[PDB]
Symmetry: D2
Subunit: 280 residues, 4 copies
Amino acid sequence: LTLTRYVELTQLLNSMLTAIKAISSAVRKKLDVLSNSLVINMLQSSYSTCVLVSEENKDAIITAKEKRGKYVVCFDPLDGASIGTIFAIYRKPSEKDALQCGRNIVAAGYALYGSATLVALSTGQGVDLFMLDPALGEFVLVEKDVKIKKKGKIYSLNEGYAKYFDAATTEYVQKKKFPEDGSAPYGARYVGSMVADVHRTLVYGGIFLYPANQKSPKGKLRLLYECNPVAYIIEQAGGLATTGTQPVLDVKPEAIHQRVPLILGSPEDVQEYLTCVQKN
Amino acid sequence: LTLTRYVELTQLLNSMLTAIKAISSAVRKKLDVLSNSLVINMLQSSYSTCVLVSEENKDAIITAKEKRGKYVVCFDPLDGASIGTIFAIYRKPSEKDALQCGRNIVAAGYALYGSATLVALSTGQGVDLFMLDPALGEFVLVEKDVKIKKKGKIYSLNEGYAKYFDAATTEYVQKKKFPEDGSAPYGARYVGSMVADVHRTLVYGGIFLYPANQKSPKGKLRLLYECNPVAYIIEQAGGLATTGTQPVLDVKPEAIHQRVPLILGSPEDVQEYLTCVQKN
Amino acid sequence: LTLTRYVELTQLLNSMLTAIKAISSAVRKKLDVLSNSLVINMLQSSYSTCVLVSEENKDAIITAKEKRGKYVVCFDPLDGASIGTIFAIYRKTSEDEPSEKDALQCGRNIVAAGYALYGSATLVALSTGQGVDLFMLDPALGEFVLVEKDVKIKKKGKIYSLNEGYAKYFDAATTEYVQKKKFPEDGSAPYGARYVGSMVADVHRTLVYGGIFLYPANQKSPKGKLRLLYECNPVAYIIEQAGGLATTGTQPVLDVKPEAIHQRVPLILGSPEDVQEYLTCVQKNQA
Amino acid sequence: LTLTRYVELTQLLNSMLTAIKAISSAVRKKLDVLSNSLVINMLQSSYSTCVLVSEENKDAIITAKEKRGKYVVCFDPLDGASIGTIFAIYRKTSEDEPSEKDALQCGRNIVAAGYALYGSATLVALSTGQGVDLFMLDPALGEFVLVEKDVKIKKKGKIYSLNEGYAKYFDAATTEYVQKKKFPEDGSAPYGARYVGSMVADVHRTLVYGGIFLYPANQKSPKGKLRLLYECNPVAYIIEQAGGLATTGTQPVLDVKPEAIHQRVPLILGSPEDVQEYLTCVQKNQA
C-alpha cells in the first residue's frame, strides 16, 4: 500500500521522501532557500551520502567526517502554480563523482506539488506512482510500473522561441499542427515548469521539448539534476529522452551545472523528432 | 488579515468559501460529482440562493420552499495538475434569472487548487487575492486590489488548433513570435486548465485566448459560469475580456450552457488582438 | 451546520474562534506566551474590544483608541494531554474611561462565554444566553461543526471530581460530602472518582456526563484557588446556561462582585442535585 | 530525528505506526470497530504476524498462512478528551500450530511494546528492550519525531492515581496506603490526587511526572479490572523499561503467566519508591 513499506540506500530514500513531505507542507504554506536545507540535511543525516549536488548550491557538497556513505545525490530541491522536486542517486573521494552518466543511476524520481502531491520513483524495475495521503502522512501506491503511451497526441514546447529554432524543430512542429496524412493535429500544452510538463507526458503520452535554439546554444535544462533524472524515469517507462544527438542518459557530464537540450516522451513521437533532426 | 472578517449575501459568500475549503481538502485526497453536491448544498443552505446553474447539472436549480433568497449563483464546481472553482453571483421566479449579462454580477471569483490554494474574489471594488492557511483553515489576504500589467510578454493559447484558426488569430500569433519592431517575441504558456491560465494572466500579465475556430464555431468556453466570472475579475483588475466582437460582460446570455470565444489579459495586448480581428 | 454561519459581538466572536483554531494547531505542533499573543492580537484587531484581562498579564490591556470597541474580554488563553482556552465577554457599561474597573463586573453581566478543549479532538462550548451549543473542529474544513444544540446537564450525576490529596486541608462540609460520595447512607452505589486537574477538562466532563466538580476553599487556600474573572465566571455561565449550578459555597459564582482582576473564588459546580447536596453540607456545618 | 529512520520486527512496527497515524487522524475527525479494523489489517499485511489478540475480538485472529510471519501481537486499538492505543509484541516460540496458546506468554517475553496517546498532541511511547523512547507526531510532516531518548521514571513521585470512588470496596492495604498519601505520618505534604480514568493517560502522566497508579483488586473486582494481555503487560513493560515497577500486589506483572486471552490482573505501577510503599501495605496486611 504505502511507500515506507516498499522502501541501506533504502534509508537514504525515506530520508529524501521526508524532505519532500516537508517541502510539500511548506509549499501549501525565502523558499528555494529553505527547501535546500531540508533536502541537504535529511540526506546528510540518514547516514548514506558522500557527495550532494544541488541546483541552488553552485559548488558540490561533500558530506564529511562522522558520516560519509556509498551514494551520490543530485537534486533540484524546488523547481519553478506547479512546483516540483527532482533527484537522481548514484553509487561510486570528491566532486568528480556526480559526473557519472545517467546510465549509472541507482535510483531517481520527482515530486510534483500540484492539486495533490505526486511522487514518481524508480530503482530500475519500472516507474511507480505514489500520492501523498495527507491524513496519514504517508505516500500510497497509486500505480505500479507505469508505461508511457506508444504515441501521443500532445506536443509540448515554448513556441515563443519559434523565431530562434533550428529547422528540424520547425518542421516537426509544423507536422504536428499540419499533419499531411489526413489525421488530426496534435494538441499543445506547456506549463513551463519542468516537472509538470514531464509528468503530464508520462501519464498522457506525447512529446516534450526544450531544444537548443540560438539563445541557448547548449540548451537550458541542467543535465545532472534535471535532465538525467526525468530521462531515467521516462526510459524506465519505456519512453525516450534524447539531447537530439545522443540519448540523454549517455552524455558523459562535464560540469555539475552543465546544460543540455531535452526531448522526451512517447517513443514513436521522439523517433519522429529524431528523423526531422537527422534530415538536417 | 483573513477572509471571514472582511466578508446578507455575505453569508452566501462564506458558504461558497466553505465549499471551496472542502473541495480543496478532497482534491489533496467520482470527484466532479462530489464537488457539485458540496457547492450546491452549502449555497442552498446559508439561506441566500434562489437559482443555481452548474456545469455538471444541465438543468437550472431552483432552491425551493423553506428557503429562497435574493441571489443567483452560476458556477463550475471543478474545472479540469491544476484544477479550480469558478462562480458568479447575480441579483434579480425561475431559470431565466441567470441570463443577466455579466454587467449584472454582484460578486464573482475563482479558487485555484495548485501548489497552494488561492482565491481571487471581487464584489466590485477591485480584485483581492487570498491564500488558504491550512494550519488555520482560514483564507488570508495576500494581495489587495490587484491590477493587471498594462502589457504582457506572454501569450496563451492552444496552437494545436493553428490549422483551424481565423486569419486574425494567425496574424496576431505571428506578431507575437515574430515581432517586426525589433523587440523580443512573447513567451508562450498554456496549461490547458482555464483557471490556471486565467490566474497566471492576472498575476503576470499577457493575453489568453480560446477563440473560435472551425471546429468550435461559437468557441468552447461556457459563458455563464466560466467566461462571465473571469471576465469580471480581469475587467475589475483593469484588463479586458472580449469574445472578439463584444466585451464578454456585455453578451446577453441566451442559454445556460451557451458557449462564447474568450480573449482576455493585459489591456494593450487585447487591443492589439482586436485590431487584428477588425482588419478581417 | 457550521459555526461561522450561525451568527459587533459577532466579529469579536470570530476573532476568538480564529485564535482558537490557531492555538489548536500550535498545541498539536513558551507556548503560553504565544497563545496569549494570538488571543490579544486577534481580539484587538476585531475592532470590538476596549479592555482585555488575561491570565498571563498582571495588568489589564487597554485597546488603543484607534481600534477601540464596546466589549471587555477576560480569558485564560491556554489553561493547563488535555488543556483549554476559556473566555468571558462583558459589555462596557460605564462610559467614563475604559479602565480595568470595566473588567470588574459580576458575572450576571456576561454577554457571551465559552471554552475550547484541545483533546482527542478540539471542542468548543459556547453560550450567548440562549443555552449552550457545542462545536467540533473539522480539520478537513478548517471550521467548527455544530454537534449538540442546547446541551442540558443531567439533573444528577454519578461522578465527583476534586483533588482528594487536599483531604487534610478540607473544611467539614467538603469532608462530609466526599464521604457520602464514597460511602452513601441511602443504599446507593458510591459515586465514581474523576479528576484530570485541567479545569477545562474536568468541567467539560461534568457538562457532558453530569455530576459535580469542586476546587473549594481549604486551609492552604482560604479564598479558593481558581480565578474568578476568566476561569470561574465563564464556566459558571456555561453550566448555569446548561441547567446546572455554580456556587462559591455561599453564593452563586455569577453573583460575586469582583474586587481585583486576578481575584480568587471557591468553585463547586455541576448537576443541580449534586451541588444542592454539597450546599447542604455547607449550611449544616456553618451552623 | 525521525521515528521511521531509527530502526522483520522493523516492518511489523511500521505497520503499527501507520495504523496509529491513521487512528489519530480519525479520532481528531463505532470508531472502536474502525480502529480495530485499521490495526488488524495493517498488522496482517506487514507479513509479520501469525496470531493477533485484540480487546475487541473474543477469539484470537490467526493470520492466513499466506501472510504468516513470526510475531504475536496483543493490542487495545483504542482504549477509552484523552484516549490511546496499546500494544505488546511477542515472538512465536513453539512451532506447533499457530494457536492462541501463542498469545499466552508471560510478559517477560515481550519483544517490543508501546502505546500511543491521542491528546493535545499525539505521543508514542515505545520500548524494544533498551529503554523507553518518546515520539511526537508532527502533522506537518506525517511522521513521528523523537523528543526524549531513554526516559527514566522518577525514583519517587508526589501524585497517587486511582478511583477513590471504590474506597468502600478496598482491601486493607489499599485503604492504608491511600490514607498515608492524604495524611503522611512523616511530616511531609500530602501527595496530590490525579485520575483521568483513561489508563493510557494515567500511566503516561505517571511516566512523565512520576508517582503511582493503581487499579487494584477490590470486592466487586477480586481479580482486578484491567486486562493482562494487551493493557497491563505492555505498560508494565514500558514502566519497568523506564526504571519503575509494576506489580499485581503479589508479583511482578510481567511474571504472571496468562491462562486466557482476556484474563484480568490488579495493576499497581509507577515510581519505585511509591510501588514499594504500596507493597509494604500489602505484605503487612496479608500477615
